[PDB]
Structures are given as structure tokens and as C-alpha cells.
Amino acid sequence: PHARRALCLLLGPDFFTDVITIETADHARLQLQLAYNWHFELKNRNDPAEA
Amino acid sequence: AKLFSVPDFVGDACKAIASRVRGAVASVTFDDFHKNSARIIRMAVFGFEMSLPKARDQAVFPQNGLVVSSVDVQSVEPVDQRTRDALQRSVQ
């Protein structure tokens, strides 16, 4: 919930080495490591509201 | 100020969704509750018809304006050891 804390909001492309605990229709409980290839998007990188 | 109407909004939201989810899963077999697990639990939270048919995409509480955008359920535990390695013979 709250582990890391930094002064900067990383906008560059990155990933999250997250693992989920999902269950399929056959009830098969399996955990699975995810990446979430993400990146922040700003069309106008000067507007105070959007920024 | 209507935001602070309920002083325990976290508990209120959890209890209301839990109650309605439990009541709706109460009407379905275990086979159905596991085939359409997310489907029936998500229609349980905000049962209506605005999209069989999908209900909506908003679970609003008019008391304080608290809106549950979506409801996510992680894993069906069933705790007893007899649902356990007896459905495991079912596995075999």
C-alpha cells in the first residue's frame, strides 16, 4: 500500500514487477508475474492544469 | 458537508457491497458462482439492466456521493478442508 516514497514522479516508460493471484473459471488458483509496460502522456507539457 | 454524512464510509461501502454480493450469490449454485464468478458478483453489486445483459458501470451511494466505480474480487478461498483435497480428487 505504501512502501516507496520519492520526490520525483517518473514519467518515462517503465514497468511494475507485480504478481497477481487470479482464479480462472476452472477455479485454478495461479499467481502470475506482470510487467505493465507504462508511460505518462502529456500533449501540452507546459499547461499547469494538465501538468 | 454531505461528504462527511457517514463517519465510516469505508465500512459502509464494504458492508453494503458484501451484503448484496452475498445475497445474490445465495441464489446461484457453486458451479454457476464459479463459471460466471466476476459476472454475477459485478451484477450483484449494482443489479440492473442498462447495457443476462450487463447492468451498469456505477455503484453510487446517494448518502454521501460515494461512487464505487467497479468491484473486484480476488480469489475464492473456500476455507474448509473438505472442499479442499476432495475437489482435489475431482482434479485427479
Side-chain angles (χ1 to χ4, degrees), chain A, chain B residues 1-49 53-92:
Chain A
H2 296 322
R4 217 183 80 206
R5 44 190 323 177
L7 279 299
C8 63
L9 182 71
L10 278 173
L11 320 175
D14 203 313
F15 60 94
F16 309 130
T17 182
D18 170 30
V19 66
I20 313 164
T21 300
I22 67 176
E23 205 168 324
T24 192
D26 308 337
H27 304 88
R29 285 187 195 177
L30 62 93
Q31 89 175 0
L32 71 169
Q33 300 213 349
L34 271 294
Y36 314 139
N37 204 156
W38 65 277
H39 85 294
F40 274 104
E41 176 165 336
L42 302 164
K43 64 178 75 65
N44 190 0
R45 262 156 171 244
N46 60 51
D47 171 74
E50 169 178 57
Chain B
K2 209 181 75 170
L3 286 178
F4 301 80
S5 294
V6 60
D8 197 1
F9 81 104
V10 175
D12 172 74
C14 300
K15 70 175 181 62
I17 304 194
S19 72
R20 203 176 302 113
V21 160
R22 195 278 308 158
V25 65
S27 65
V28 307
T29 178
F30 184 75
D31 178 87
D32 189 35
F33 171 57
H34 198 70
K35 262 71 172 172
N36 310 273
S37 286
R39 168 187 172 282
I40 72 168
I41 200 171
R42 185 175 63 85
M43 61 79 71
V45 183
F46 53 89
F48 204 51
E49 289 73 40
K54 289 318 177 164
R56 290 181 68 189
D57 52 347
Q58 194 155 232
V60 63
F61 300 151
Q63 49 187 1
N64 60 344
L66 163 56
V67 167
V68 180
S69 61
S70 65
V71 161
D72 308 339
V73 57
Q74 294 169 10
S75 69
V76 296
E77 198 44 78
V79 54
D80 62 298
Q81 203 56 54
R82 292 141 165 169
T83 305
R84 281 178 183 172
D85 49 346
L87 286 179
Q88 195 56 43
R89 277 89 60 82
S90 161
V91 183
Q92 177 175 1

Short mmCIF file of all heavy atoms in Angstrom, two decimals, chain A residues 21-27 29, chain B residues 30 34-35 74-78:
data_model
loop_
_atom_site.label_atom_id
_atom_site.label_comp_id
_atom_site.label_asym_id
_atom_site.label_seq_id
_atom_site.Cartn_x
_atom_site.Cartn_y
_atom_site.Cartn_z
N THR A 21 -2.83 -12.76 -7.93
CA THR A 21 -3.36 -14.07 -7.57
C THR A 21 -4.75 -14.17 -8.19
O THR A 21 -5.74 -13.75 -7.59
CB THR A 21 -3.39 -14.27 -6.06
OG1 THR A 21 -2.07 -14.16 -5.53
CG2 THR A 21 -3.94 -15.65 -5.71
N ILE A 22 -4.81 -14.73 -9.40
CA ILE A 22 -6.05 -14.80 -10.16
C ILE A 22 -6.64 -16.20 -10.03
O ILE A 22 -5.99 -17.14 -9.57
CB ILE A 22 -5.85 -14.42 -11.64
CG1 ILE A 22 -4.97 -15.46 -12.34
CG2 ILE A 22 -5.26 -13.03 -11.76
CD1 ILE A 22 -4.81 -15.22 -13.82
N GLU A 23 -7.89 -16.33 -10.46
CA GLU A 23 -8.60 -17.61 -10.46
C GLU A 23 -9.45 -17.70 -11.71
O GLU A 23 -10.28 -16.83 -11.96
CB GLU A 23 -9.47 -17.75 -9.20
CG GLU A 23 -9.74 -19.18 -8.80
CD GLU A 23 -10.35 -19.30 -7.42
OE1 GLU A 23 -9.98 -18.49 -6.53
OE2 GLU A 23 -11.19 -20.20 -7.21
N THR A 24 -9.23 -18.75 -12.50
CA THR A 24 -9.96 -18.94 -13.75
C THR A 24 -11.30 -19.63 -13.49
O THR A 24 -11.65 -19.97 -12.35
CB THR A 24 -9.12 -19.76 -14.73
OG1 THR A 24 -9.72 -19.70 -16.03
CG2 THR A 24 -9.03 -21.21 -14.29
N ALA A 25 -12.06 -19.84 -14.57
CA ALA A 25 -13.36 -20.49 -14.45
C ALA A 25 -13.27 -21.91 -13.94
O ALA A 25 -14.24 -22.41 -13.34
CB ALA A 25 -14.09 -20.47 -15.79
N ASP A 26 -12.14 -22.59 -14.15
CA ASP A 26 -11.88 -23.88 -13.53
C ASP A 26 -11.35 -23.75 -12.12
O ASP A 26 -10.79 -24.71 -11.59
CB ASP A 26 -10.90 -24.70 -14.38
CG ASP A 26 -11.32 -24.79 -15.82
OD1 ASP A 26 -12.53 -24.64 -16.10
OD2 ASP A 26 -10.44 -25.03 -16.67
N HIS A 27 -11.48 -22.57 -11.51
CA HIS A 27 -11.11 -22.30 -10.13
C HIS A 27 -9.61 -22.39 -9.90
O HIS A 27 -9.15 -22.36 -8.75
CB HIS A 27 -11.82 -23.25 -9.17
CG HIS A 27 -13.31 -23.24 -9.28
ND1 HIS A 27 -13.99 -24.06 -10.16
CD2 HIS A 27 -14.26 -22.55 -8.60
CE1 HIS A 27 -15.29 -23.86 -10.03
NE2 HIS A 27 -15.48 -22.95 -9.09
N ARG A 29 -6.37 -21.65 -8.99
CA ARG A 29 -5.67 -20.55 -8.35
C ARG A 29 -4.21 -20.54 -8.77
O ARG A 29 -3.44 -21.44 -8.41
CB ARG A 29 -5.77 -20.67 -6.83
CG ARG A 29 -7.12 -20.28 -6.28
CD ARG A 29 -7.09 -20.27 -4.78
NE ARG A 29 -8.44 -20.24 -4.22
CZ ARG A 29 -8.71 -20.28 -2.92
NH1 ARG A 29 -7.74 -20.32 -2.02
NH2 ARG A 29 -9.97 -20.30 -2.52
N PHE B 30 -22.84 -23.39 -6.72
CA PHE B 30 -21.39 -23.19 -6.70
C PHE B 30 -20.82 -23.23 -8.11
O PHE B 30 -19.91 -22.47 -8.45
CB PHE B 30 -20.72 -24.23 -5.80
CG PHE B 30 -19.24 -24.04 -5.65
CD1 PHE B 30 -18.74 -23.03 -4.84
CD2 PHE B 30 -18.35 -24.86 -6.32
CE1 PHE B 30 -17.38 -22.85 -4.69
CE2 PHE B 30 -16.99 -24.68 -6.18
CZ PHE B 30 -16.50 -23.68 -5.37
N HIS B 34 -18.92 -20.07 -9.82
CA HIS B 34 -17.55 -20.12 -10.30
C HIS B 34 -17.41 -20.00 -11.81
O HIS B 34 -16.39 -19.48 -12.26
CB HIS B 34 -16.84 -21.39 -9.85
CG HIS B 34 -15.35 -21.29 -9.95
ND1 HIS B 34 -14.60 -20.48 -9.12
CD2 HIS B 34 -14.47 -21.87 -10.80
CE1 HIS B 34 -13.33 -20.58 -9.44
NE2 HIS B 34 -13.22 -21.42 -10.46
N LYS B 35 -18.38 -20.43 -12.61
CA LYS B 35 -18.34 -20.16 -14.04
C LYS B 35 -18.42 -18.66 -14.30
O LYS B 35 -17.47 -18.07 -14.83
CB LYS B 35 -19.48 -20.90 -14.76
CG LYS B 35 -19.05 -22.21 -15.41
CD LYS B 35 -18.76 -23.29 -14.39
CE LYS B 35 -18.52 -24.63 -15.06
NZ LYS B 35 -18.05 -25.66 -14.09
N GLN B 74 -10.84 -11.07 -5.68
CA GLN B 74 -9.54 -11.64 -5.99
C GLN B 74 -9.54 -13.15 -6.12
O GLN B 74 -9.16 -13.68 -7.18
CB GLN B 74 -8.52 -11.20 -4.93
CG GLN B 74 -8.25 -9.70 -4.94
CD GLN B 74 -7.46 -9.24 -3.73
OE1 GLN B 74 -6.94 -10.05 -2.96
NE2 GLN B 74 -7.36 -7.93 -3.55
N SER B 75 -9.95 -13.89 -5.09
CA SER B 75 -9.83 -15.34 -5.10
C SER B 75 -10.91 -15.94 -4.21
O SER B 75 -11.17 -15.43 -3.12
CB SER B 75 -8.44 -15.78 -4.65
OG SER B 75 -8.25 -15.51 -3.27
N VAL B 76 -11.54 -17.01 -4.69
CA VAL B 76 -12.49 -17.78 -3.89
C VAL B 76 -11.70 -18.83 -3.10
O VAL B 76 -11.11 -19.75 -3.67
CB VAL B 76 -13.61 -18.40 -4.74
CG1 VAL B 76 -14.43 -17.29 -5.39
CG2 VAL B 76 -13.04 -19.28 -5.84
N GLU B 77 -11.65 -18.65 -1.79
CA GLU B 77 -10.85 -19.40 -0.83
C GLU B 77 -11.27 -20.84 -0.52
O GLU B 77 -10.41 -21.64 -0.15
CB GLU B 77 -10.78 -18.63 0.49
CG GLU B 77 -9.65 -19.06 1.42
CD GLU B 77 -8.33 -19.24 0.68
OE1 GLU B 77 -7.68 -18.22 0.37
OE2 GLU B 77 -7.95 -20.40 0.42
N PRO B 78 -12.54 -21.25 -0.74
CA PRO B 78 -13.33 -21.86 0.36
C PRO B 78 -12.52 -22.60 1.41
O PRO B 78 -11.75 -23.52 1.13
CB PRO B 78 -14.26 -22.83 -0.39
CG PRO B 78 -13.75 -22.88 -1.81
CD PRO B 78 -13.15 -21.53 -2.04
#
